[PDB]
Design a protein around this ligand. Structure first.
Ligand code: SF4
Ligand code: SF4
Ligand code: SF4
Ligand code: FES
Ligand SMILES: [K+]
Ligand SMILES: [Zn+2]
Lengths: 124, 181, 218, 240, 157, 112
């Protein structure tokens, strides 16, 4: 409708089509940043007149992939430790407080951590 | 000494059997290598497949968790200061001496002499009226001998060597070899 | 009323009752500081400004110690260098490794003063980990990352004395002390955003400006 | 006839916790510092009329002279038996717009005789002349040409002074501090004129000034004093 | 054996007569755990305004917890001693000084007993422990440190 | 001083008849307590009213035509900056640095 293709939204109101070349990403229709130029507007340029849009680089949207990861629930501890699950090949190790009654993501990886006592509240 | 080395002691691919005997007969210098690296020895474990477990090397005095105050090894902030000697300060050092060999009066009588060199004092005037033994002992060296330009490395000597030692071209070639001595 | 004191062999003269850190600035001697600001009330909770009084067996905080006539102040002895490295190590003990994701990166006083006066290496290898503090919500202007706070009370002093907003304070005791409003509310002040400039670390940052630039670019 | 050993399989030494000395690198120059102080003072004593001042930093000696004294000092440092600096390894300049005389003209001399190096410093403005040491050192011909090309310093007495680095007809002296790093113009091929032409500079991406991110705190202190004890003004003895 | 109760006689021997509170310790007691209790006391009783004692007492408490079990190294005995020096003389009040002496008292006269715990602890774990209580297999996975004995001694709760 | 050194510098005439330079001492940043950057006098040029910055459509680059946009001279004294600006025949103006008023500050004032 060209409104979902040119406006930043938290979620796509429809199912992304992997074969649609007007989407921002193969797995996401709408852009994920307010300053991110829409792909449909970008491809409407004189330099795409005789160019095949299918072979252009279209990496998957990282925002949709990170939220497919289940929340890590910590038992008998209010602090979560994350370093990228790689150690020396990850990110600097940081400590996440889990006192609040919600899942709190990592500052680097985006993995979300929470206490098991809040599992019922978060899922609903 | 890097004398001649047999071909089989060099890490290059060589000949075998009859073809090795033929090579020795036909080659002018049979101990020379073909220059082809050994496929079974050279770079056989590639750098990306090394089994060595690397560890960061740390020295004890400067890389330990104890007795390792940083200011004890902070050489960057303990750099030598930049000091320039003009003709006024050189005249003061010549007239009053140095702190190593003081020649300045004591007490308030000595501070009068120091305050003289707080303004412009020409060195030529200082040299004109001064005891000549001071110049021969402070400005000059060894009782009046001129001050030679100091060497950047006092251990930079040389000695002429012959072919039997350095192994380079014989004496009929127009170059010579100097050792450390 | 002027008193002729000495700071590293430099004659200084300021009004009676002036702090040593004020006389040092007039003499051209730089003393590191976190909790001292020339517009806020005097606090001595950061201990980064410690200097050595000539005839005294105790180290005095230059931001709070009044000046006396004939006082001689040393600010660069090895004893003070030990104090600066020791205080820096304590500040960075529980500080989160957040510089890449922290908006104070290129304009951080904790970074610059740790580089200038602290050691080049840390010794915190504890497996228990650092302190973790939840982020307080105080409105849409001030973004809070309270892991990065060094408990310097610049925000508390400013909002209570200068801004006149007493809803911001320090709650708790010891290592569990947390800056904030205790209850879930916002800071109501037309001058509240000046707390972002006063905060020397990334604990309090601009929310509209978050993540958009680094100071060296501007 | 024996096979060559596998260097990978050869045993390697085992090392415990390594140790290393911790000392100031300036300590190894203690002999060089004092000797250069004496030699630098000897030159001032020999030439009080020309040597304004001298300085010593580790193993580098610098002599400061006026432009009218450059020829005499260089001649002395070249022909004196105690200081035979026959080789002039470099002639360069530096721009200091703050001072009345912008440019410091620097001469680095080498004495293969005594294995020593010395430095001569003079000053110049945009219009003041500097004597050419080409008659003394023929190797300074190109260095003085390069200094003029990048700074504009007037070398009086140079047999052939002209550009050596910039394009023919270049306007400006690049190494001056007021000269922009990207210059003023750029070149391209004009199809209409069938030749390469100069056009005013326009950058598709302007150079980004990240130097404004310099630290707001001083990084190095006042340093440590390494003046030889034989070159400090003495302190008089106290009261009786 | 020859201590006289005075503000000076006890000062000479390296101690102090604060409130005459004499605490007797027989040989059948955990001396390191007793001193560890003092460190945990001052961490909880720290008012927490100055940087040293707010952070040092927590730093001392974390290190003393590994000493009571032996999950540390012998060189770290000098590390904790240095950390106590960084607390003394750099605080507004005397609680920072009061939180460093008990640790130093353990090190001064009872250092061999602290080394014994480290030697004994390595026997159970087999491989020696690295700095901070880490092993050769300990790594962080999914929000926690696994494959490593963690000193869960922070009052739980 | 009176010498018109711009006749031999080689710089284009637009630096004199079209550009304005500012002689200033950098103000202390509000986010930091350091004052090292305020100890030196600097000279920069006012931006061009047009063409100072424009967006390149191919990649979003910041295009410019001002060749002095990235030039900032450093001086140790105010007099040196004025003497150099006068020597080059530049049209300039001086921004006098703001000086902080001294007020006594003691811990006793927290209660009195
Ligand atoms: S406040 Fe400073 S030290 Fe802390 S994370 Fe941010 S930039 Fe790094
Ligand atoms: S939040 Fe910032 S200003 Fe407030 S006490 Fe902590 S470091 Fe200081
Ligand atoms: S040393 Fe005293 S005043 Fe300072 S934080 Fe500790 S208990 Fe509070
Ligand atoms: S600046 Fe003085 S103790 Fe904080
Ligand atoms: K801030
Ligand atoms: Zn992570």
């Amino acid at each position: 409708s060209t409104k979902e293709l040119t406006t930043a939204r938290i979620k796509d109101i429809s199912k992304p089509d992997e074969n649609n070349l007007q989407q921002q990403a193969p797995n996401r229709i709408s852009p994920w940043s307010k300053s991110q130029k829409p792909r449909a507007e970008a491809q409407d340029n004189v330099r795409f007149a005789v160019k095949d849009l299918a072979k252009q680089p279209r990496p998957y949207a990282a925002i949709d992939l990170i939220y497919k990861q289940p929340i890590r629930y910590i038992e008998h501890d209010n602090v979560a430790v994350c370093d990228g699950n790689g150690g020396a090949q990850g990110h600097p190790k940081v400590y996440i407080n889990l006192d609040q009654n919600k899942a709190i993501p990592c500052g680097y990886c985006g993995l979300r951590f929470a206490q098991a006592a809040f599992k019922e509240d978060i899922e609903s | 000494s890097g004398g001649p080395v047999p071909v089989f002691k060099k890490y290059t691919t060589g000949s075998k059997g009859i073809w090795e005997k033929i090579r020795q007969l036909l080659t002018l210098v049979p101990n020379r290598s073909t220059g082809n690296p050994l496929v079974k020895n050279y770079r056989v474990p590639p750098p990306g497949s090394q089994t060595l477990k690397y560890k960061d090397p740390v020295t004890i005095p400067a890389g330990d968790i104890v007795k390792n105050q940083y200011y004890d090894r902070d050489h960057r902030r303990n750099y030598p200061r930049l000091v320039a000697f003009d003709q006024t300060k050189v005249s003061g050092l010549l007239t009053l001496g140095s702190a190593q060999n003081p020649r300045i009066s004591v007490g308030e009588k000595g501070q009068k002499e120091l305050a003289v060199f707080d303004q412009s004092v020409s060195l030529s005037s200082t040299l004109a009226t001064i005891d000549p033994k001071v110049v021969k002992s402070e400005l000059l060296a060894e009782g009046g001998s001129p001050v030679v330009a100091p060497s950047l490395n006092k251990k930079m000597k040389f000695r002429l060597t012959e072919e039997s030692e350095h192994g380079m071209y014989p004496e009929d070639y127009p170059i010579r070899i100097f050792a450390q001595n | 009323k002027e008193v002729e004191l000495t700071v590293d062999g430099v004659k200084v003269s300021i009004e009676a009752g002036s702090s040593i850190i004020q006389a040092a600035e007039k003499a051209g001697v730089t003393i590191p500081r976190y909790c001292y600001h020339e517009k806020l009330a005097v606090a001595g909770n950061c201990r980064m400004c410690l200097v050595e009084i000539e005839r005294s067996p105790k180290l005095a905080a230059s931001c709070a110690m009044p000046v006396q006539n004939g006082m001689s102040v040393l600010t660069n002895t090895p004893k003070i260098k030990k104090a600066r490295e020791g205080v820096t190590e304590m500040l960075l003990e529980n500080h989160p490794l957040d510089c890449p994701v922290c908006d104070q990166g290129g304009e951080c006083d904790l970074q610059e003063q740790s580089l200038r006066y602290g050691s080049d290496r840390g010794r915190f290898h504890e497996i228990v980990g650092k302190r973790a503090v939840e982020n307080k919500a105080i409105g849409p202007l001030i973004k809070t990352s309270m892991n990065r706070c060094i408990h310097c009370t610049r925000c508390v002093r400013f909002l209570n004395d200068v801004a006149g907003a007493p809803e911001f304070g320090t709650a708790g005791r010891g290592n569990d002390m947390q800056i904030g409003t205790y209850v879930e509310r916002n800071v109501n002040s037309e001058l509240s955003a000046n707390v972002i400039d006063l905060c020397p670390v990334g604990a309090l940052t601009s929310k509209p400006y978050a993540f958009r630039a680094r100071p060296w670019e501007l | 006839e024996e096979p060559l050993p596998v260097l990978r399989d050869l045993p390697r030494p085992e090392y415990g916790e390594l140790h290393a000395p911790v000392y100031n690198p300036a300590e190894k120059y203690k002999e060089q510092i004092e000797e250069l102080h004496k030699f630098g003072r000897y030159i001032m004593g020999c030439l009080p009329k020309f040597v304004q001042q001298f300085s010593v930093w580790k193993d580098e000696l610098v002599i400061y002279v006026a432009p009218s004294a450059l020829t005499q000092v260089a001649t002395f440092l070249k022909d004196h038996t105690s200081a035979q600096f026959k080789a002039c390894m470099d002639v360069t300049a530096a721009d200091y717009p703050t001072r009345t005389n912008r440019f410091d003209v620097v001469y680095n001399l080498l004495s293969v005789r005594h294995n020593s190096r010395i430095r001569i410093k003079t000053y110049a403005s945009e219009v003041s002349p500097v004597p050419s040491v080409v008659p003394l050192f023929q190797g300074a011909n190109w260095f003085e040409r390069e200094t003029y090309d990048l700074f504009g310093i007037f070398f009086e007495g140079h047999p052939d002074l002209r550009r050596i680095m910039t394009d023919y007809g270049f306007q400006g002296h690049p190494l001056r501090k007021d000269f922009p790093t990207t210059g003023y113009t750029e070149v391209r091929y004009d199809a209409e004129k069938r030749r390469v032409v100069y056009e005013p500079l326009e950058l598709t991406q302007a150079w980004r000034n990240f130097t404004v991110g310099s630290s707001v705190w001083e990084q190095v202190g006042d340093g440590k004093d390494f003046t030889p004890e034989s070159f400090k003004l003495p302190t008089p003895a106290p009261d009786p | 054996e020859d201590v006289l109760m005075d503000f000076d006689a006890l000062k000479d021997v390296g101690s102090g007569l604060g409130t005459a509170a004499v605490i007797v310790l027989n040989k059948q007691t955990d001396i390191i755990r007793a001193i560890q209790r003092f460190s945990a006391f001052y961490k909880h009783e720290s008012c927490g305004q100055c940087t040293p004692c707010r952070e040092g007492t927590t730093y001392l408490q974390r290190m003393m917890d590994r000493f009571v079990t032996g999950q540390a190294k012998e060189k770290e005995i000098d590390l904790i001693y240095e950390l106590s020096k960084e607390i003394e003389g750099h605080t507004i009040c005397a609680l920072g000084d009061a939180a460093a002496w008990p640790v130093q008292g353990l090190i001064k006269s009872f250092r061999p007993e602290m080394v014994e715990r480290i030697k004994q602890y390595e026997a159970k774990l087999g491989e020696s422990v690295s700095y901070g209580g880490w092993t050769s297999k300990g790594k962080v996975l999914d929000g926690k440190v696994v494959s490593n004995p963690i000193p869960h001694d922070a009052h739980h709760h | 001083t009176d010498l018109a050194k711009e006749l031999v510098s080689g710089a284009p005439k637009e630096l004199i008849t079209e550009r304005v330079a500012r002689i200033y001492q950098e103000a202390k940043a509000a986010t930091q307590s350091g004052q090292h950057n305020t100890e030196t006098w600097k000279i920069d040029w006012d931006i061009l009213n047009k063409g100072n910055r424009w967006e390149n459509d191919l990649m979003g680059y910041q295009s410019s035509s001002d060749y002095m946009q990235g030039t900032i001279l450093k001086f140790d004294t105010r007099e040196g900056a004025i003497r150099f600006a006068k020597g080059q025949g530049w049209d300039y103006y001086i921004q006098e640095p703001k000086v902080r008023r001294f007020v006594k500050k003691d811990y006793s004032a927290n209660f009195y």
